[PDB]
Structures are given as C-alpha cells and as structure tokens.
Amino acid sequence: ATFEIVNRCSYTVWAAASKGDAALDAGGRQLNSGESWTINVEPGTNGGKIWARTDCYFDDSGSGICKTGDCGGLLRCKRFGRPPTTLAEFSLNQYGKDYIDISNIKGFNVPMNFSPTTRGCRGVRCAADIVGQCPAKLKAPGGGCNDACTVFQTSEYCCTTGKCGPTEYSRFFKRLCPDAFSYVLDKPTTVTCPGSSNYRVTFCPTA
C-alpha cells in the first residue's frame, strides 16, 4: 500500500512510520512545509502507525532528539514515538479489509487527516486546536497535549484491568475530536476500507 504523507503545517515536522518492532519503509523523514513523502507499507501490516515529530535535531548519522514523538532519538523510527503524538493507525489486509483510525490515546501534538486515496470508505480527521485548548495538567512543556495515562499512570486512565470509563481528560480529547479514540475502551471510530486501499496522512489539514 502507498501512504502519501503531506506536511501542510507552516512548520517542519519529521514524519515517522513504524509497526512498533520495525520501521515502515525508511521509518522517518524531515518534511518541510508543503513537502510530500510517499512510503510503501507491506500488505498484511498489522498495528502500523504514522505520526509527526516536532522540533527535531538530527546529526549526520540520523541520531538526535524531538520534543514530540521521539523514537529512541532516531531519524528513521523502528519503535513507537514518545507521547504526545496524534496517531494515524492502520491494520492492512485483515480478512480482506483495511482498518484505519486516528487516536488521541497517546495524546496530541499535530492536527491530522487520515484519508484513503482509493474508493470505498471515508477519511477520519482530528484537526481541532487540542494544544491551544489543552487542560493545564496535560500540557507537555515540549509542545502538545498529553493523554491522562502518560501523565498520571493510573489503572483508570491506562485502562490496565481492561475495565474503565471515559474521564474528564478523555472527554476533553473526544469533545474536540469525536472521530478519534480518546481512551482505550472508547466506542471505536475505526473506518473499514477495502483490502489494499492507498492513503494520505496530511499534517495540518485545514491550517
């Protein structure tokens, strides 16, 4: 499957693409404002994620740091990024279907559109100003809006027992982005696509 990753942000992001134990394609790249990065994702990729990283410094060997979504200090991500990270999430060719969503379960750094470029289903979007409106106790100093599980490390916010409810913090992300996961047992906002759909992830889709 092709993912086009477009930075529509006025600022540079460092796109990242990972399935948690491995890079997807090159796994990361600098996107200046308006730049597009096409990646190939293997069919049958389960638990794939795309995210932006903000304020990166990388030396000549691709080693450094980001204020949001840093994955062990690499330009080319093999691992998931550090919260806060708006997540484009996908499972491809799962019994003849693609599953896509946006998640705020690991917080929010960069507004995001995740859409098919092929026919047969709809995109999802989390484009609200979640960082500007972010509750005082979730504000990451680096930039972005932590989820309550990253900040407080409770069984309720992390949904550790597999039982828990919505919270004041999950309802803040859900109110600004109804079409994204706000907590682990949120009513699913997963869109079903045809197996072998292609996608665009757009950072800052409206701004």
- DSSP code, position 136: G
Extended beta strands in the chain, E state: 2-7, 13-18, 23-31, 36-40, 48-51, 54-58, 64-68, 87-94, 97-103, 112-116, 124-126, 180-181, 191-194, 199-203
Sign of CA dihedral 192, 180, 87, 53: positive
Distant-in-sequence contacts of 169-172, Cβ < 8 A, 24+ apart: 169/135, 169/138, 172/133, 172/134, 172/135, 172/138
Q: What is the resolution of this structure in A?
A: 2.3
DSSP 3-state assignment of 2? strand
CA distances (Å), origin 127, targets 75, 155, 179, 199: 25, 29, 10, 17
> If DSSP states are collapsed to H, E and C, what string results for 147-172?
CHHHHHCCHHHHCCCCCCCCCHHHHH
State how far the Cα of 165 lies from the Cα of 138, in Å rounded to an integer.
Answer: 18
State how far the Cα of 158 lies from the Cα of 105, in Å rounded to an integer.
Answer: 9
Method: X-ray
- DSSP code, position 117: S
State how far the Cα of 154 lies from the Cα of 167, in Å rounded to an integer.
Answer: 12
Sign of CA dihedral 115, 179, 88, 13: positive
CA distances (Å), origin 196, targets 2, 92, 94, 172, 193: 9, 7, 10, 34, 8
**According to DSSP H, which parts of 45-200 are helical?**
148-152, 155-158, 168-176
**According to DSSP H, which parts of 19-139 are helical?**
none
CATH 2.60.110.10 assigned to domain 1-207? The reply is yes
State how far the Cα of 187 lies from the Cα of 165, in Å rounded to an integer.
Answer: 11
Distant-in-sequence contacts of 172-176, Cβ < 8 A, 24+ apart: 172/133, 172/134, 172/135, 172/138, 173/104, 173/108, 173/130, 173/145, 173/147, 174/104, 176/126, 176/128, 176/129, 176/130, 176/133
CA dihedral of 37, 7, 5, 114, whole degrees rounded to 10: -170
Q: Residue 85 in contact with residue 32, Cβ under 8 Å? A: no
State how far the Cα of 92 lies from the Cα of 135, in Å rounded to an integer.
Answer: 35
CA distances (Å), origin 128, targets 53, 173, 179, 189, 193: 18, 9, 11, 16, 24
CA distances (Å), origin 126, targets 21, 84, 176: 26, 14, 8
Tell me which amino acid residue 30 is. Answer: Q
The conformational region for residue 132 under phi > 0 = left, psi -120 to 50 = alpha, else beta, is: alpha
